[PDB]
Amino acid sequence: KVFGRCELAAAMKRHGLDNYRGYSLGNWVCAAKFESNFNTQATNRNTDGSTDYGILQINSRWWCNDGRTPGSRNLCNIPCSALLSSDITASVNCAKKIVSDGNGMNAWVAWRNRCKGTDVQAWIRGCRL
Ligand SMILES: O=N[O-]
Ligand SMILES: O=N[O-]
């Protein structure tokens, strides 16, 4: 599923991401835009053989099991395919664990490079939240 901007913002708010660990809703929408273009089916292979999955491009090296990343961890206790569903519950819950890990949103390369220090509130402007 490819989410609309305000549609994703609303789902993220409903799932409790707005100000989670002090990151405003705009930060999460910005990250999702640049990680996956709001597409829940997005997948990208990393150089080390792991893969990033879903709207927030959650990585199989640490967070999920894709049956092809030998020696990796499954810290969110899910198959990586659960991250590709039209329902973002699994992605959101795993993202909450990731952002709590110690590095905050710097865990997301796209966020650090394209969202951090910018006017992220512009990503939720015009939405009925
Ligand atoms: O969800 N339409 O911006
Ligand atoms: O992601 N474990 O193959």
Curated annotation (Swiss-Prot):
Disulfide bonds: 6-127, 30-115, 64-80, 76-94
Keyword Disulfide bond: yes
Catalytic activity: Hydrolysis of (1->4)-beta-linkages between N-acetylmuramic acid and N-acetyl-D-glucosamine residues in a peptidoglycan and between N-acetyl-D-glucosamine residues in chitodextrins
Entry comment describing in which tissues the protein is expressed: In the egg white and polymorphonuclear leukocytes.
EC supergroup of this enzyme: hydrolase
Molecular function via GO: beta-N-acetylglucosaminidase activity; identical protein binding; lysozyme activity
CDD domains referenced in this protein's UniProt entry, alphabetically: LYZ_C
Entry's EC annotation: 3.2.1.17
Gene3D superfamilies attached to this UniProt entry: 1.10.530.10
Keyword presence, Signal: yes
Alphabetized UniProt keyword annotations: Allergen, Antimicrobial, Bacteriolytic enzyme, Disulfide bond, Glycosidase, Hydrolase, Secreted, Signal
Family: Belongs to the glycosyl hydrolase 22 family.
Function (record text): Lysozymes have primarily a bacteriolytic function; those in tissues and body fluids are associated with the monocyte-macrophage system and enhance the activity of immunoagents. Has bacteriolytic activity against M.luteus.
Subunit structure: Monomer.
Name this polypeptide is given: Lysozyme C
Species in which this protein is naturally found: Gallus gallus (Chicken)
